[PDB]
Amino acid sequence: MDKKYSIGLDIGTNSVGWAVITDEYKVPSKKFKVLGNTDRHSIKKNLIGALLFDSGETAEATRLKRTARRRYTRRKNRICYLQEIFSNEMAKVDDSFFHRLEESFLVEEDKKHERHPIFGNIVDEVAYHEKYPTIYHLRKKLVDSTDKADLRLIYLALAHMIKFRGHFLIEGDLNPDNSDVDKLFIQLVQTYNQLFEENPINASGVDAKAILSARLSKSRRLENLIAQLPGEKKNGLFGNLIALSLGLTPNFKSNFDLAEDAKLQLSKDTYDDDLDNLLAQIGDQYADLFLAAKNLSDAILLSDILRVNTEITKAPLSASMIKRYDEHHQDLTLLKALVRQQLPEKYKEIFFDQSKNGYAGYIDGGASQEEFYKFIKPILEKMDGTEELLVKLNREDLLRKQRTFDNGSIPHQIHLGELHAILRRQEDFYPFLKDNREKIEKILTFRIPYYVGPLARGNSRFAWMTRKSEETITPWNFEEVVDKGASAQSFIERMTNFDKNLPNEKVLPKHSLLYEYFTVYNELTKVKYVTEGMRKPAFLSGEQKKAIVDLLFKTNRKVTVKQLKEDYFKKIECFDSVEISGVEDRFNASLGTYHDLLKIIKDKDFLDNEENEDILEDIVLTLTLFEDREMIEERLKTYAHLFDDKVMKQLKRRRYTGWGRLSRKLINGIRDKQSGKTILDFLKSDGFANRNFMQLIHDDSLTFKEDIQKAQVSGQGDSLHEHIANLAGSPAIKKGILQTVKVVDELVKVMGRHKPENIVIEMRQITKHVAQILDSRMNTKYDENDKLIREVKVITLKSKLVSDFRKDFQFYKVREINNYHHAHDAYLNAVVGTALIKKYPWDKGRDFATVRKVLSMPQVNIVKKTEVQTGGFSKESILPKRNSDKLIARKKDWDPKKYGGFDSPTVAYSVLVVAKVEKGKSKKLKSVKELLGITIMERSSFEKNPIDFLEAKGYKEVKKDLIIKLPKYSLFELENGRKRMLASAGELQKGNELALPSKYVNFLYLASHYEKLKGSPEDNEQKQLFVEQHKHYLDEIIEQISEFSKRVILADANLDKVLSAYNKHRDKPIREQAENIIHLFTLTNLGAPAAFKYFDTTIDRKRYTSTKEVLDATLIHQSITGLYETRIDLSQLGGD
DNA sequence: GCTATGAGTGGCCCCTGTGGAGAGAAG
DNA sequence: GGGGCCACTCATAGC
RNA sequence: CUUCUCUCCACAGGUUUUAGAGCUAGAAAUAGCAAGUUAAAAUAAGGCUAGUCCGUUAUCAACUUGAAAAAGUGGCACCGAGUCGGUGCUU
């Protein structure tokens, strides 16, 4: 007989609970065949379980690593281009200079040339290091000196600037010369007073330098400066100028009574064009005011970056660096003097001991500046004469280095200015510097646009660039080779959705005219109007809709019901009183794009001509796709003969954002085979039918619907791995859903391939995705009317109902005891779901007894999914060289004993190998049987040829047939039922689960929440009395933990510590005792051992660091549900 | 008895921070 | 949070 | 309206080895003194499809077919419950 059965599921991020129950809520038990070479031929197991797995990972880390790799490759290529430029002239001076630079990492033994890189002789190297203590001294020397310098110093300065070219967050031109705040503020005030003599501003006595350069937010500084100026407001014209000078985006619409918004921001790429537009409307007499404001903004921005302006030089950054160096020297001398004068004993600690956070640890050690200040501040406070030192410490300027974390705010314009100064001064002697100055400035300033992406020849899955030619892309011919416009189009396109109705079609922009007309006609479709003498409301005719649109929508931005009534029904149709239903106050759809185009083009006939629909759609698409105005102008140039220069310039100014939901081929692309009208045409006029879009698509008579179902095809692949990958959510939930699908498939396979009556799920849109997938796979048969026969009911509940069911009938849940709660929740969800569904398409004693029996079952199939670990080869921290064989070489020729390297590799999976190993100085062969961990790095070589890989490690005569793949969490069974999971090649994990009786679980749950019960006072008192009467369960729980520990955990030290700790705290309050005992299950939990705290005692974790014991145990392969399993006894393998 | 070796135990180790642009769904 | 690594102590086989 | 997910563009550090002649007294251990701020190269081993590209996401119990994708392989009922046991039928 086909037994009716239901499946309950519980899907989480780390688990998939599953339970199969029959109509009477009893979980069936079946006898399963066991394969392998053991004596256990058949095993009885209840059909209930839980699948556990590691949480899924987001692709953020891989993306960050890939972006970093591209950055590093491109920086290397910049240095290579500079060396290629300098190659011809360097060969005449020193041919081996570049080779010496490259080999600076190798030790003296491994170098092919002389060890000193710059000059190749110690005398000149020492002379250079004495003359220029830091690279900034060399940079300033080249900036200020007019003498012919060595080409090597020029190369060093240029390479240092190119390699560390600073940020690009401030596009435009930045002038370090106007770096004084007060003078430019005074000039701006004077210009404003000259332009506004009737309202002069008194700026006398106001310290602009302090207020504008203070370490406060932009708005606070703006409010502070305005507060010092009588009669001025932060919303005034001068207030807006100051806000612009502080890096805000002030609005000048109110200051000049403009019709449209006038917002200016210097950091934007379009400050110049917006400022020009503002001047074109308010006059060019205000240009000097904006120039002065821009100069003041530059001064404010560069005040922090560069600090010295008194001297006449073109390298302010180098001057500031040298000032930091000199201040550090002076402070170090003073500090040494004071320490040696007052605290001689601490001199060794501060200036010699690298392990501490003193100066020695600050320079040669790894101590940070913050740590150094923390260490030195109490010492300085204990000595006299440290007032200046304390003040500098409070400002984060004492003994400061030159390469700190604050250098992230240096714009690339400073570096470009220094580069240009050096090139200009040194080009008088070197013609190749004169000829190639533009190339060098390009190399420093060239940056791949964000919308072009990686420059690949198709062999990359991340690349969307289109190439005009096949030449190699270089920064000098980037514009000629890479089609920027097509690349921007593809960049925007690939991220937008396909149409829901047609998966092939691309969606239209939101502000397209066709979409707006479609929405307007759809809204007017359902509008009803009632006039005097009319018995029933009537729909608007096509002529009426056309007249209404032409008279109101094309003339008013927003159309209301009152406007319609007063303007069309009363004026045109002569209806004095009309009642309108379907629209409450105003129409949702509006022709904003049409109004904008009428304002710009100023030609209504051009907009209203049907032949111009394609041109207008293309123009709107161009406006929405592109952000750079040059691309917009280039593409709109095709229409230059249709619009004048002013119109073309104005069109270059409007930008649209957002995309629609329906494609053009849907609304106005497909045509009816019988009538030839498109959906838009039907909305314009459909006779008495007046069908809206929903009515048109659902209407069977119209060809559009069946042409739509014919347009969709069954997705190749798709269902299976691909379809779940296309859902909306974190990849963790995708992994969970795929595991749930496989669990259900295997359960169907188990029950004789008879599909279940019901499938109950709880975890809502992701719930909808799971339900759709399950229903799609289960139901595949259609009736004679092509209606899908729902043989399986996919029913979705919410966890609140099951939680209330648990709380009402005392089926309590404690997560820390074991992993059975997943299976129990699946079973209870199945019970409640089936009861509710059969009740709305339950004997008390018998059903409740069945539930008690099920929840007290000891045998639940908990399965840990075996996973081949992948990821990074090892830890990324590079360690100092040591005499150890466990270091990993960062390059093929870099011996870790000399250069250091990586450490702690991660093992992908282990292999059991039976072979012979030479041991001892006698090199005698001995048979071995052990686990060798194949690292992630060596995985490819091992899978390529395991025999050679094993021979290279010293194994001889390898038995190929016995090589067993053992991924992580492989399960081994040992004597007395003790089980261990393979954590790695040399560590194990606990594999057994504690099965407490439900009475102890109930007692623990009631005791832990003794003062947190949520219920009636009588029920709370009854539960409290139940807890108090059953205090002896605590001893029983401890005894059972001890028994299970002695049986499978083998933690004698930890167990004795726990037992002693319990004995000392045996008088603690019952709630505290239970709360602390719940921690003790951390000893017996499945998985990796972990530390835990029991009252005031901390128990360290017990790690199983030996895998020799499992080499003679039983290997268990478990299927995804744990029902089908193959047992292999390893002790019988490798026998002599 | 000495030497080199494996096995158990306790403790320490882990790359980080920021800006800009675009697109999508889900509540 | 969890596996890798090292320093220290103690049987342990072999000489 | 935001959060989250995906993709591209850049920056600043960090670590590693090497260069920046250490001096004096002593046979040496060692003790005293002087100096400290910077720079070059690498930043997953490398791969071929030779690009200013790609290399940490996702997927993966065992056996048979295959290069892989992928397909196939395991009796039922009843009585009980400490990780599942027993009995009958089929066999």
Q: Residue A720 CB closer than 7 angstroms to strand D?
A: yes
Rounded distance between C-alpha atoms, residue A915 and residue A930, angstroms:
9
Residue at the smallest CA–C1' distance to nucleotide B6: A1106
Q: Which nucleotide is nearest to A922 (CA to C1')?
A: C14
Residue at the smallest CA–C1' distance to nucleotide D55: A66
Please, which positions of strand B sit below 7 A from a protein CB? 6-11, 13-27
3-state secondary structure of A930: strand
- Give φ, ψ of A1116 to 5 degrees: -115, 120
Query: Would you state the structure tokens that stand for residue A627, as one six-digit string?
Result: 């952000």
Resolution (A): 3.3
Rounded distance between C-alpha atoms, residue A971 and residue A678, angstroms:
64
Give which of A335, A320, A518, A508 is closest to A414, Cα–Cα. Answer: A320
CA-to-C1' span, A411 to D26 (A)? 57
End-to-end CA distance of chain A: 52
CA-to-C1' span, A507 to D46 (A)? 43
A961 annotated binding-site participant: no
Query: Would you state the structure tokens that stand for residue A63, as one six-digit string?
Result: 């993306």
Query: Would you state the structure tokens that stand for residue A965, as one six-digit string?
Result: 């793949």
Contact A965, A978 (CB under 8 A): no
A257 annotated binding-site participant: no
Rounded distance between C-alpha atoms, residue A672 and residue A217, angstroms:
62
Beta strands in A717-810 (DSSP E): 758-761, 793-796
* CA A308, A310, A315, A321 torsion-angle sign: negative
Per-domain boundaries in chain A: 5-29+39-57+730-861, 67-168+412-445, 181-298, 316-405, 612-661, 989-1131
Contact A879, A901 (CB under 8 A): yes
Query: Could you list the active site residues of A?
Result: 10
Rounded distance between C-alpha atoms, residue A389 and residue A398, angstroms:
7
Residues written for chain A: 1136
Name residue A459's amino acid.
N
Q: Would you identify the CATH topology of the domain A5-29+39-57+730-861?
A: Nucleotidyltransferase; domain 5 (3.30.420)
CA-to-C1' span, A365 to D89 (A)? 81
Which residues touch A656 (CB under 8 Å, ≥6 apart)? A509, A510, A511, A593, A620, A623, A624
Maximum pairwise Cα distance, chain A: 118
Query: Would you state the structure tokens that stand for residue A597, as one six-digit string?
Result: 């185009």
Q: Which nucleotide is nearest to A988 (CA to C1')?
A: C3
3-state secondary structure of A981: strand
Which residues touch A124 (CB under 8 Å, ≥6 apart)? A116, A118
Contact A867, A969 (CB under 8 A): yes
DSSP A266-305: TTSTTHHHHHHHHHHHH-GGGHHHHHHHHHHHHHHHHHHH
Please, which positions of strand D sit below 7 A from a protein CB? 4-21, 33, 35-46, 49-62, 70, 74-87
Q: Residue A55 CB closer than 7 angstroms to strand C?
A: no
Query: Would you state the structure tokens that stand for residue A355, as one six-digit string?
Result: 């392990």
Rounded distance between C-alpha atoms, residue A228 and residue A211, angstroms:
10
Which residues touch A799 (CB under 8 Å, ≥6 apart)? A762, A763
Experimental method: cryo-EM
* CA A957, A963, A968, A973 torsion-angle sign: negative
Contact A716, A731 (CB under 8 A): no
Residue at the smallest CA–C1' distance to nucleotide D19: A116
